[PDB]
Amino acid sequence: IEALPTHIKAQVLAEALPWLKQLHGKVVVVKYGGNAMTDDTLRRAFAADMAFLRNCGIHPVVVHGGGPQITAMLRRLGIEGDFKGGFRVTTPEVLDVARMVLFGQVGRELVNLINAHGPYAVGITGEDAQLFTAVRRSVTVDGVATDIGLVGDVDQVNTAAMLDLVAAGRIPVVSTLAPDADGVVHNINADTAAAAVAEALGAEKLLMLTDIDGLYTRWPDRDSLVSEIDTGTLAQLLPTLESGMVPKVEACLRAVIGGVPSAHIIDGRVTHCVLVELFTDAGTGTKVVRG
Amino acid sequence: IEALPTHIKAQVLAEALPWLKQLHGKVVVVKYGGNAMTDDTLRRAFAADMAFLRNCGIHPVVVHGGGPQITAMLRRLGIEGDFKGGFRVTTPEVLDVARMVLFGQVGRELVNLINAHGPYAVGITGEDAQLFTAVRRSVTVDGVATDIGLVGDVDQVNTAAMLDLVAAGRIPVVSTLAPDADGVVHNINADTAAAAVAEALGAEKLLMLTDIDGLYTRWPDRDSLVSEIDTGTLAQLLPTLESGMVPKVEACLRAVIGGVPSAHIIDGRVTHCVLVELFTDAGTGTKVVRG
Amino acid sequence: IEALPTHIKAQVLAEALPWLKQLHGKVVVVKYGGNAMTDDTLRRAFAADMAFLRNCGIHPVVVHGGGPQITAMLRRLGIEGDFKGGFRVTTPEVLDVARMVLFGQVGRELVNLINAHGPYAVGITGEDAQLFTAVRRSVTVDGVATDIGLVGDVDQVNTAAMLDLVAAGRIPVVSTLAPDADGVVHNINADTAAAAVAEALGAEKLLMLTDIDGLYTRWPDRDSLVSEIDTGTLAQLLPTLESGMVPKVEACLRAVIGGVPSAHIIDGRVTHCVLVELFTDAGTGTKVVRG
Amino acid sequence: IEALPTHIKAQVLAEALPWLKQLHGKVVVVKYGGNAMTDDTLRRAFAADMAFLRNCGIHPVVVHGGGPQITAMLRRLGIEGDFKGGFRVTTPEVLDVARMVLFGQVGRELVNLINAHGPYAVGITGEDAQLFTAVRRSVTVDGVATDIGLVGDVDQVNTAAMLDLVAAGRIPVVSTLAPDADGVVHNINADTAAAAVAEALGAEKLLMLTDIDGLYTRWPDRDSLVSEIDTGTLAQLLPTLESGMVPKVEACLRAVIGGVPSAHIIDGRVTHCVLVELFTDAGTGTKVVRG
Amino acid sequence: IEALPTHIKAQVLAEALPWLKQLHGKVVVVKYGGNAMTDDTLRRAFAADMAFLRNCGIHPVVVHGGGPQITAMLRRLGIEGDFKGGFRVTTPEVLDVARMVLFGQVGRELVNLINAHGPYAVGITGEDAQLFTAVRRSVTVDGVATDIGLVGDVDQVNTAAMLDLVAAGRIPVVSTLAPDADGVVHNINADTAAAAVAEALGAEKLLMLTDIDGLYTRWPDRDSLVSEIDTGTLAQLLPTLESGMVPKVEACLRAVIGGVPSAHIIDGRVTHCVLVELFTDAGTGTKVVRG
Amino acid sequence: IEALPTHIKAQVLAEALPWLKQLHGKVVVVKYGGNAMTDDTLRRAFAADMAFLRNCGIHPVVVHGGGPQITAMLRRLGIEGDFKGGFRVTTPEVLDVARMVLFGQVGRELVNLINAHGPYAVGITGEDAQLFTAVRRSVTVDGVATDIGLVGDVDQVNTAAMLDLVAAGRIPVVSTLAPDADGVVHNINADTAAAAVAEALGAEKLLMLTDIDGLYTRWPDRDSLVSEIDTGTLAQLLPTLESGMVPKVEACLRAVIGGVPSAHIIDGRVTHCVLVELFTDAGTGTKVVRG
Ligand SMILES: COC(=O)c1ccc(O)c(I)c1
Ligand SMILES: COC(=O)c1ccc(O)c(I)c1
Ligand SMILES: COC(=O)c1ccc(O)c(I)c1
């Protein structure tokens, strides 16, 4: 820990200066999911890292999901699911559970972890002050698209009140639930949502915390791994990717095409992954830029 | 509805003018519980009334409880309670349920009901931006006081960020959960809490929505009912009151002694009770002032 | 007064909520003339109504005339008039009298009536801080137009300083006198002027207080009366109207065509007419919209 | 006009610099009466001088009277006066005439004269936005004091809204009429009033435009004239002064004792007297300081 | 000094009022060189004149040169010059001397002279907060252009931070040294620079303090002197001017064509020349306007 | 450089978080002298470190000296010194040289080094906008105190305009020259000055860049070195210190007693010493706190 000469303790800090300039006064949207939210030691480091950005004058906006904890509460409550394709149909009953688990349990832990370093985080959904709206989403079941309930994409973002909040010195911890135009609340996929917030707010970077080292073009060839890719190439390769990392990837493309400078798929198993990806050239992840 | 001559439609409005002057630019804390939150028609009217205040330039702050809905989720989850006196011991397991039911279910309905009239409500607990803190509370079991878990009173209120919020045009819908000084979240009794917010913010009025016509000194003598009372008399009469209305009453006294001009115990069974109590001399409730 | 059940006292208030939302933060120009300014009881109610709007966060701007009081001072002073058509020629002598009666008598009563409810009203003419200018107006005598002295229409409005004033929480009570480009003060017809202010300021509504129930297309067929009309129809019907209500009508059309959402011709004999027309669907008057 | 070498045109300007520093950003109250308001050439110069101060960043506040023009309108109207001592009893009838002559005639000329140089002046009385209040004043008739109607001294000044106005770049032209606490408007002596405004606003200087060269201790010994005097000496000499200059003098003492640095009694017959007194050491007037 | 009747002391002041209106709230760039900076009495008057403008609410920006004092320090240091044409080649050694003489000696005197009247002046070069940049300049030696070292014209001006400074009440005293795009500091000709600042800031007037009465078209015919000229005529006459006044003239044309209303070539031997040129019609100088 | 595992690249950054919280939004005064200003590689790192603080939202204020460069210019100019004790008498001739070397050479390098990372630094002396004043200082020659010319201590600091500057996002690079009350400029010892600025501005930390590892109580016993000390002990030990480090030490005590939390004597030979001392527990220097 300290058997490390100082002369180079100084050097690692001093090589963060370019990215401190790059990110000073800018929005950085961080999608936070996977194991980064399961292990206590990683969780506290993630929190402390949000504190870090905010004591450098960067404006983080956290967007979290919560698949597994939702399904655990549904079984605990004995709510039998219905499944079309692999998707659970989101009934009014399911929606209310998703809402109370995402907003009243998962988001609360992150808010309390970040607020140990200061009065920074505040939790919100699209319902609070109409910050964002949803629009119902059908999924393609297998050729035919069909309805799987009250799920949707982010429809509109109140960019104004959002950047009021972070300029006021606050870290928004977002739960991806939103009203539609008639007031009916839908659950939104947190990867998609994070790309939609990042684009609305003119974020400098989208950070996608995933449980993989990075994007392998030829999974699992160890050296197929890639550290940077354009949108156009990533687009043509999208249909050849593993099931779970497809949402993290179209989020990246919809954001970078949407004008975000770069989207990053990083390893949420590395402790302090965001500090590594933002202020260090030794990034585990993969960068996505337009092209 | 309209078989009412207009010449007096005009008169009822014009007699709201004194209380519009009294309340323009001021904080009004409304504790919202009882049946006012059970019946849909009353609920929508309560929401529309919060919208009303806010389109007159009054600054409402809603504080809600949720006893019955909490205990319903505990039984649904099969969490066996422990009971000292009549109090349920609030385990870490119970606390997390209280939190997710108060913040992720009950507060969400009120936020969505108010936001049908505009981007006004935002939900918060004392955890968000450290708005308020708690301090653990023992209750007197029966002579001896003893511990009944993670319950406490409101400890400190960030008056500053709170009045920033309402001046920004927002209606805070508060869930009474708060960190203590070491970050551990307690459940706070929503009547107490509402008196503590009202005092911190320099509210003009505390409104206590209860399921009774008003305070009867000699329950149930029909004419023992009283429309106004001082603190000192109400204090001496406190030990002679029904079990459930004692918390609504010491909240009133701790607020009015605390410098709030008046606390009001009103009938949440009357539709639009807050509009009646605030802009009309035909108030069902009972007013509490210092003396 | 109070033999009116409360359950419906509550209902009349709660049905003002849509127009409180419609009018919150907006300009409402009220032309104030006729009997509304002759009877003390109506006058005090008009004042209290301006106070009302301002304690709901609406921004009233009052524009008053004063034909009869001017001619009374001219006779009291023994100033013999000259008359072309039915118009009095406005000499420098007449102008100074009009000015001192409109600004130093009539406007002063309204300012003092409104200021019994608070420091709200301030009187002004177009001369103060160059708020508006005039341009001399000839009238068509009977085929030929000819000069009838220092009378004119509103030329330019300093929209900026005007909306500074009402955002500063003030109710402007305007006397319709204005400099021309060379500094010479003209009298302006207060109906015209009110339409010109309303258009300049982006008012939500123009309210024209008149001494009639509303606009009768076939005066005096009792049922020719109409509650709403477009500009285009009202235009084609303008040449068929009574002598005194023509100015109230072209003011309405020049304002609504000018982009004001609606102009209203209301009964200033009804006590609290503006409260009835603004927050109630039982409006005596007639609404004018574009078409 | 120009047969004046420039080398000294430069010198007179450059010797205004100390008083530009002294007066930059400060309030200067100017009481404006006497011949300064009767002759057109002097009047225009007075106006242009107010424009001058305001284009140097000084904050002038003009306070005018109007004895003779009031009595002319009373005779024109055939209102017979009643006289106790030499004072006219101010009936409700007289008050309304005073008000309409001061505010609707006299103040209007000054506003239009100043506004030829820019949108600067705005007229006001104590009735507008409750800027100042009056309190009824009895005068000592001759030993015994008695009532002479609705006349009073300035009671309270809304210092706040007043300095809002001049910081907003406006020159207030004040008519000395004010409500009392029950809303009844009194006429206030414009010398007194000017001392009361100056003290309330923390004026740097009070300027009293009078029709005399200055204060002669032994009128009419030509060399009894004095250019500067303390309060205490001026106090002891007050009972030995001419009838008309006593009000100009107790105004001076009540202001300078009230904390205004200096009061000045200047010759309103000199063209541009205020420019001479403020930016030149060749002042005709007499300075009053505390002592 | 005072044997000058006051009645006309008043008149000279009152004839400054139009130019006080013209210049209130505007930028006036004054290039300050020649004898105006050599004689102590003229220097103090120049300073006091900058103080003057700033206590009238004008925003002066001073730009100074310093040819002779630079060459004196080079000889004092024994730095042998190299000369192409009549130009000294500006070596890194020469540049550092120019910088320390212009910024650390010449500008310091002016700052301390102006700050005797108040905390107004602040010295700056283009290096401070990157206020302006330079671009290297070759001069035409005699037909062929060639390099004469680190000299350049003003490249870009941070108009924003510049007008922040003067609105903050400060008088910038500029030394004409600026970084290029790679950070290398060049010396800039102070006449050119002053025209470049004036254009960037939207100055009302450029004042060029020169050691001549004005521009003589046929030097030295006494009556060839001219008080006003357009750009187009001045352009065609530029190749027929004396060696030293050519830079003062193309500065004038590049500024007035650049949109500055007028450039003025004035006599810095006249004491208080800027006060004479700005607030008096007896200007020694010559005005340049577009045409 | 990169043969350093990342897992601990992450760790060194994450251990800066406490001092980022401690220093966010605070003033840090850095005295910059010694070798830190002689070697190019150290100089650029010092600059980049000031950039660092400013892209974390810390407010650095640099105070530099320049003994050796002054004496070099005096010899280059052939100015013979006069010496009382070991002190050079500071003649008007010497002062002007000190001023032009400190402000026009030394401060210019630091400004240009910092401005390679952004428009941040601005140079100033106490002469600019009267930011600080001096008061002449005699030194005790050897028992008797005597005059050694225009040298003094910092007299008063305009705290207001100073913190305006850094909140405006600027890094002040201060040259220690200041006017006295009569406008005469003195040279101030840059260690003293830095303690005086730090106290005036409520700095969080004073950083004293020195050419020693730290304070040795028993120089040169290698282990007499100390990492933290109180004021009271340091006071009693002051008379037993080496000649050159006495000024760095009484600056520390006058600042910490003056209410600065801590003063630090650090090794300006270590590259990036300020980054090490501020964001790392491996500090070479010695901390001074009150006691
Ligand atoms: C626009 O929304 C807000 O301002 C907001 C929402 C939730 C909060 O906890 C807080 I503090 C502010
Ligand atoms: C732009 O005009 C004004 O601001 C104004 C005019 C009259 C007043 O009585 C007041 I207070 C403000
Ligand atoms: C943009 O530059 C400045 O704000 C500035 C520069 C130098 C100063 O002495 C001062 I005070 C402000």
Side-chain angles (χ1 to χ4, degrees), chain C residues 108 112 115 121 128-130, chain D residues 108 112 115 121 127-130:
Chain C
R108 297 286 86 192
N112 290 320
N115 287 9
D128 300 293
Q130 292 173 356
Chain D
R108 297 286 86 192
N112 290 320
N115 287 9
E127 325 159 76
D128 300 293
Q130 292 173 356

Side-chain angles (χ1 to χ4, degrees), chain A residues 122-124 128-129 131 161 165 170, chain B residues 122-124 128-129 131 161 165 170:
Chain A
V122 295
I124 57 151
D128 300 293
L131 279 176
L165 196 53
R170 308 283 193 209
Chain B
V122 295
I124 57 151
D128 300 293
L131 279 176
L165 196 53
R170 308 283 193 209

Side-chain angles (χ1 to χ4, degrees), chain E residues 108 115 121 127-130, chain F residues 108 112 115 121 127-130:
Chain E
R108 297 286 86 192
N115 287 9
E127 325 159 76
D128 300 293
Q130 292 173 356
Chain F
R108 297 286 86 192
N112 290 320
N115 287 9
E127 325 159 76
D128 300 293
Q130 292 173 356

Side-chain angles (χ1 to χ4, degrees), chain F residues 134-145 147-155:
Chain F
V135 51
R136 187 198 222 80
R137 187 210 193 305
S138 99
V139 81
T140 46
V141 312
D142 200 305
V144 53
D147 175 274
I148 59 170
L150 317 162
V151 303
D153 304 298
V154 166
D155 186 3

Side-chain angles (χ1 to χ4, degrees), chain E residues 122-124 128-129 131 161 165 170, chain F residues 122-124 128-129 131 161 165 170:
Chain E
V122 295
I124 57 151
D128 300 293
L131 279 176
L165 196 53
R170 308 283 193 209
Chain F
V122 295
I124 57 151
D128 300 293
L131 279 176
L165 196 53
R170 308 283 193 209

